[PDB]
Structures are given as C-alpha cells and as structure tokens.
Design an enzyme around this catalytic site. Sequence first.
Site, PDB file in Angstrom:
ATOM      1  N   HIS A 398       0.780  -1.046  -0.131  1.00 39.72           N
ATOM      2  CA  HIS A 398       0.051  -0.142   0.034  1.00 39.72           C
ATOM      3  C   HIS A 398       0.835   1.264  -0.024  1.00 39.72           C
ATOM      4  O   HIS A 398       0.716   2.242  -0.712  1.00 39.72           O
ATOM      5  CB  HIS A 398      -0.964  -0.044   1.228  1.00 39.72           C
ATOM      6  CG  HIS A 398      -1.796   1.301   1.533  1.00 39.72           C
ATOM      7  ND1 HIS A 398      -2.920   1.421   1.128  1.00 39.72           N
ATOM      8  CD2 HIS A 398      -1.319   2.586   2.041  1.00 39.72           C
ATOM      9  CE1 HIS A 398      -3.351   2.414   1.418  1.00 39.72           C
ATOM     10  NE2 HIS A 398      -2.263   3.441   2.021  1.00 39.72           N
ATOM     11  N   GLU A 399       2.057   1.104   0.919  1.00 38.46           N
ATOM     12  CA  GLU A 399       2.617   2.516   0.855  1.00 38.46           C
ATOM     13  C   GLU A 399       3.457   2.774  -0.249  1.00 38.46           C
ATOM     14  O   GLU A 399       3.708   3.769  -0.644  1.00 38.46           O
ATOM     15  CB  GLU A 399       3.768   2.368   2.082  1.00 38.46           C
ATOM     16  CG  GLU A 399       2.870   2.131   3.521  1.00 38.46           C
ATOM     17  CD  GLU A 399       1.590   3.234   3.689  1.00 38.46           C
ATOM     18  OE1 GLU A 399       0.740   2.776   4.624  1.00 38.46           O
ATOM     19  OE2 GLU A 399       1.691   4.183   3.412  1.00 38.46           O
ATOM     20  N   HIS A 402       1.678   4.610  -2.841  1.00 39.05           N
ATOM     21  CA  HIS A 402       1.701   5.943  -2.704  1.00 39.05           C
ATOM     22  C   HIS A 402       3.083   6.521  -3.263  1.00 39.05           C
ATOM     23  O   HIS A 402       2.979   7.348  -3.971  1.00 39.05           O
ATOM     24  CB  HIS A 402       2.008   6.281  -0.987  1.00 39.05           C
ATOM     25  CG  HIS A 402       0.732   6.242  -0.518  1.00 39.05           C
ATOM     26  ND1 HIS A 402      -0.561   7.142  -1.064  1.00 39.05           N
ATOM     27  CD2 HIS A 402       0.280   5.741   0.695  1.00 39.05           C
ATOM     28  CE1 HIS A 402      -1.645   6.794  -0.050  1.00 39.05           C
ATOM     29  NE2 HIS A 402      -1.061   5.895   0.790  1.00 39.05           N
ATOM     30  N   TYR A 440     -11.856   2.250   3.273  1.00 39.89           N
ATOM     31  CA  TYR A 440     -10.738   3.131   3.522  1.00 39.89           C
ATOM     32  C   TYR A 440     -10.337   3.993   2.094  1.00 39.89           C
ATOM     33  O   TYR A 440     -10.095   4.884   2.271  1.00 39.89           O
ATOM     34  CB  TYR A 440      -9.623   2.753   4.304  1.00 39.89           C
ATOM     35  CG  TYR A 440      -8.386   3.766   4.522  1.00 39.89           C
ATOM     36  CD1 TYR A 440      -8.913   4.864   5.320  1.00 39.89           C
ATOM     37  CD2 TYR A 440      -7.176   3.544   3.792  1.00 39.89           C
ATOM     38  CE1 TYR A 440      -7.730   5.848   5.279  1.00 39.89           C
ATOM     39  CE2 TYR A 440      -6.268   4.310   3.980  1.00 39.89           C
ATOM     40  CZ  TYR A 440      -6.428   5.677   4.882  1.00 39.89           C
ATOM     41  OH  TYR A 440      -5.330   6.565   5.006  1.00 39.89           O
ATOM     42  N   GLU A 447      -5.607   7.521  -1.414  1.00 45.16           N
ATOM     43  CA  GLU A 447      -5.632   6.661  -0.548  1.00 45.16           C
ATOM     44  C   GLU A 447      -6.485   5.461  -1.507  1.00 45.16           C
ATOM     45  O   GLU A 447      -6.178   4.269  -1.343  1.00 45.16           O
ATOM     46  CB  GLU A 447      -6.593   6.656   0.690  1.00 45.16           C
ATOM     47  CG  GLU A 447      -5.953   7.696   1.646  1.00 45.16           C
ATOM     48  CD  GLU A 447      -4.516   7.360   1.998  1.00 45.16           C
ATOM     49  OE1 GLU A 447      -4.256   6.191   2.105  1.00 45.16           O
ATOM     50  OE2 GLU A 447      -3.987   8.363   2.382  1.00 45.16           O
TER      51      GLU A 447
HETATM   52  C1  LIG Z   1      -5.355  -0.276   4.934  1.00 46.78           C
HETATM   53  C2  LIG Z   1      -4.243   0.241   5.183  1.00 46.78           C
HETATM   54  C3  LIG Z   1      -4.096   1.052   6.390  1.00 46.78           C
HETATM   55  C4  LIG Z   1      -2.871   1.696   7.004  1.00 46.78           C
HETATM   56  S1  LIG Z   1      -3.010   2.585   8.150  1.00 46.78           S
HETATM   57  O1  LIG Z   1      -1.643   2.481   8.805  1.00 46.78           O
HETATM   58  O2  LIG Z   1      -3.667   1.894   9.011  1.00 46.78           O
HETATM   59  N1  LIG Z   1      -3.515   4.172   7.898  1.00 46.78           N
HETATM   60  C5  LIG Z   1      -4.702   4.597   7.600  1.00 46.78           C
HETATM   61  C6  LIG Z   1      -5.232   4.445   8.954  1.00 46.78           C
HETATM   62  C7  LIG Z   1      -6.622   3.927   9.141  1.00 46.78           C
HETATM   63  C8  LIG Z   1      -7.311   3.670  10.577  1.00 46.78           C
HETATM   64  C9  LIG Z   1      -6.553   4.436  11.514  1.00 46.78           C
HETATM   65  C10 LIG Z   1      -5.439   5.046  11.317  1.00 46.78           C
HETATM   66  C11 LIG Z   1      -4.771   5.578  12.566  1.00 46.78           C
HETATM   67  N2  LIG Z   1      -4.816   4.873  13.830  1.00 46.78           N
HETATM   68  C12 LIG Z   1      -4.828   5.325  10.200  1.00 46.78           C
HETATM   69  C13 LIG Z   1      -2.567   5.125   7.107  1.00 46.78           C
HETATM   70  C14 LIG Z   1      -2.979   6.493   7.504  1.00 46.78           C
HETATM   71  C15 LIG Z   1      -2.219   5.164   5.653  1.00 46.78           C
HETATM   72  O3  LIG Z   1      -2.860   5.292   4.672  1.00 46.78           O
HETATM   73  N3  LIG Z   1      -1.021   5.080   5.493  1.00 46.78           N
HETATM   74  O4  LIG Z   1      -0.415   5.152   4.040  1.00 46.78           O
HETATM   75  C16 LIG Z   1      -1.563   1.360   6.203  1.00 46.78           C
HETATM   76  C17 LIG Z   1      -1.687   0.601   5.002  1.00 46.78           C
HETATM   77  C18 LIG Z   1      -2.949   0.107   4.741  1.00 46.78           C
HETATM   78  F1  LIG Z   1      -2.839  -0.658   3.438  1.00 46.78           F
HETATM   79 ZN   LIG Z   2      -2.026   5.524   2.710  1.00 46.12          ZN
END
Ligand SMILES: Cc1cc(S(=O)(=O)N(Cc2cccc(CN)c2)[C@H](C)C(=O)NO)ccc1F
Ligand SMILES: [Zn+2]
Length: 488
Positions: A398-399, A402, A440, A447
């Site tokens: 996922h990252e 980005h 999400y 995203e």
């Molecule tokens: C699905 C998914 C979710 C995450 S994540 O790390 O959880 N997240 C979103 C998030 C969601 C819920 C709560 C929080 C705060 N606790 C943050 C962060 C901001 C993100 O987009 N980083 O690029 C990372 C990779 C993924 F593939």
């Molecule tokens: Zn993200």
Amino acid sequence: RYEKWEKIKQHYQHWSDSLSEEGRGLLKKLQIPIEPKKDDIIHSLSQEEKELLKRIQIDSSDFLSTEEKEFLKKLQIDILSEKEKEFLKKLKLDIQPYDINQRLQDTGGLIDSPSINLDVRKQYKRDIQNIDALLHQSIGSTLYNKIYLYENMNINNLTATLGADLVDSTDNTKINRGIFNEFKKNFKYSISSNYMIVDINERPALDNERLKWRIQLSPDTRAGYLENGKLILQRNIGLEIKDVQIIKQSEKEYIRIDAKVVPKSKIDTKIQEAQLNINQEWNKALGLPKYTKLITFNVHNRYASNIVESAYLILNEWKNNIQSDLIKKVTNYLVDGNGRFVFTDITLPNIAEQYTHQDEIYEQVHSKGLYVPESRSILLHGPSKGVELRNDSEGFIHEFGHAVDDYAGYLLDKNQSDLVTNSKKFIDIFKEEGSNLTSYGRTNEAEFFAEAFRLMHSTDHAERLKVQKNAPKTFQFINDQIKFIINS
Ligand SMILES: Cc1cc(S(=O)(=O)N(Cc2cccc(CN)c2)[C@H](C)C(=O)NO)ccc1F
Ligand SMILES: [Zn+2]
C-alpha cells in the site's frame, strides 16, 4: 514466597529511607499516569466548538483509539466533515495523560523528538533524568542469580497482528499452537526503552495478559524497590530471550518468556549488523551501489528482534508480488531523494523522515504505515495492526502504492512535480469508482489509488479480479501508470 521479598526490600532499605518526598512523588507519577480531567477539557472549549463536539459521530473516526474515543464520549454527555477532523487532530493533543513510561516507549528513548509541545517535552525530560539519577543502586553480585523477577504483558503490546489470533477462538483457555510458533520463531532479543516495573513474586494474570515474563537480572542492573513487592528497573536495558514455552497455570494456557538482562549495546550491535546485511542483500538485488543505505531499523522496544526479522519477509513479499522493473524504477527514484524504508517499533511521529517535514504536531500521523513524499520514505510500524490489513507485507505494498503515485506524477512533469492522483484524469475516475473498493479507499484519491494498487497485487487473485471488475477505470489507469514508469 515472602523471604525473597524481604531480602530484596532489605537490600534497598537505605535507598528507600533516603528518598525525598519529591523522589517518592516522582516514582508515583511514573506508576500512575496523570489523566486529563474531563472537567477542564470542556471549560477550554468555545460555544461553537462544544456544539460541534456533541454533534460529532464520536466512535466513527480514524484517529481515535478506544482510550480517546471513550474519553470524548465521557464529556460528550457532560456538555465525518473536514471541519470535524481538523478539530479532532487539535483536540487529540490536549487529552493525553502525562505518562512517562509511554513517552519513553513511543520515542524509543529519543525524548527530544519534536512530537509533543516543547514545554511538556522538557517536563518529561526533567522527570526522566531525575528518575535515572534515583536509580543508582545495582541489584548486586549476591542477589542477581538467586532471584527471578516477573512481568505480565499483553501480547498486543508486541504484535497486535498475531495477538488477534493468539487465543484459541474455539477455547479461550488454550493457545493457538500455530500462531505461538510464529510469535516464538524470530523472538531472540528484546529492548526496554522505558522503566520496567516488575514483581518479585509472579502475579496471577489479569485480563488480557497471556504473556508471563520471568527475568534474570545482571549484577549491574540498577533498580529501586517499590512498595508491595515490586522493582523498578533502569531504562535502556537489553533482554536476551532464553526460552518461550506454553505453560499451564490454573487450567488456562499462558506463554512463559524467559529472559536474561544483557547490555543494551550488545543488542544494538546485533541490530546494526542486521541492518548492514539486509541493505547489502537488497542493494544487490535492486542493482544499487553496494554502500547505499536504503533500509533503516529504528528499533528500541520489547519485540525488537522480530521487527528486524520481519523486514526480510516483508521485502520478499514485496519482490514476489510486484514486477521487478517497477520496483527498481521506483526505488531508484526514492534513493535519488535520499529515501528510506524504515521498519520501526516506535511511533511514526518520532521518525525523522516524517517529523522533519511536519512541524505542526497536530499534522503528525501514527499508523501501521506511511509514505512521506518530502523525504521519499516508507515507514512501517511493527507492533500495531492496520484496519482491514491481514499482515505487514500488505501494508508495505500500500505505501509503495503511494510511492508509485509520487513517481508517475513526477514523470508527467518533472520540473514542478505533483502526485498522479492529483491530475484531473484520476480525480474524475475517483468520483466515479472511489466507493467500489475498500471502505478506507473512499477517503480521497491518494488512498483510493494506493488501496487499488495493494489489491491489484494481493496474493489472493480473487481480490485482484475484483478491482478489474468493480473499478475497471482505476485498474486500467494504474496499469497505464505502471507501464509508463517501466518505459521511462
Ligand atoms: C489499509 C491500510 C491502512 C494503513 S494505516 O496505517 O492504518 N493508515 C490509515 C489509518 C486507518 C485507520 C486508523 C489510522 C490511525 N490509527 C490510520 C495510514 C494513515 C495510511 O494510509 N498510510 O499510508 C496502512 C496501510 C494500509 F494498506
Ligand atoms: Zn495511505
């Protein structure tokens, strides 16, 4: 049972009697964080801001965990839009307990990290330096090998991902044997960056503590006696994992963790050698200069060795599931910007690749994973659990999505560089298909793209075909971007 306790207390009796009331108050604050008075919080809010808080769907946020969500309802009575969220980012900063041990764990001991208000940052620092000065007497050379010290711990403190399934879902008295093997496999060393509070006598486990540490100190380990049969241990100690067994206590199953205190510098040396090895291995696989430093281990806490070992597995999954040419092209761009893959067990606001570009603390983000375009870095937090992620590998991908978004937009216009997901093409695609993938995914274009990118490279090919079917323009758009990158 009580003889060990009497001898320990005796050994520290002069130390205890010598404590000033200020010293005592400090030890107390350390054991019992100072919680926010829900009273005070509302009195600081304006009329319009109170109204907005009451009418806000409290349990429906991203940023709020059970502790802060619950605390906010607690005064929702006593009294989501972009407006509501900008508000919440600021409010989150004013409701944190004053918690010395949590500050130390969140920063991994790097307490000057600009992740909290400067004035509170200095308060923590004074308190920590004063506690360090209090803890000057070692356990000594006659006691250290005659006593064990104990700590009950929640599996989620180390790995929330595996902690979801550590307990047999069919029978809560049993440990899932398979998940146990994976917890244990790469668990060879541990770091305590805060002050461990340990029991002289093993305590029956209370709710959600399935881990039972038994710890042998070294003669030099500094500590202080705490009333009711406890020790506080100096911070920055290393722990070598000696044995991890399933044991039974009162017809329930627990994980025994035997550990031996060692010099932290010994563990840090192991971590540094490992950081060398993984960079050398991957610089080669990526065709980078031998001395390139791309992978960072920012590791300071209790599941240390697994942060290290799982990076290998995460990057293998990465390489297995993404086209080689795409990986090389994007990673070269990242290295061109001095980028890093940071694998860490401290919270992401205390990572320089983030905080160096995010001065406002209300804008700093902690989460499983992050991509920071200003420093071209991917940050992956080991202990936490991403909502709707099955594992860390998927988070990483996922990252990297980005990062793909970053690089393809750069190639579009390399003088003044924007994200491809900011182009009017993708924006239109997003208002059409933006609701067709994950929950999400709906958040915004960046995203949605990254989620689509992740799903498009799942090991589960059902999940891949769902993108093609339910978001064909997004699917198409991303493959185009990928082609475009590989051909550049
Ligand atoms: C699905 C998914 C979710 C995450 S994540 O790390 O959880 N997240 C979103 C998030 C969601 C819920 C709560 C929080 C705060 N606790 C943050 C962060 C901001 C993100 O987009 N980083 O690029 C990372 C990779 C993924 F593939
Ligand atoms: Zn993200």
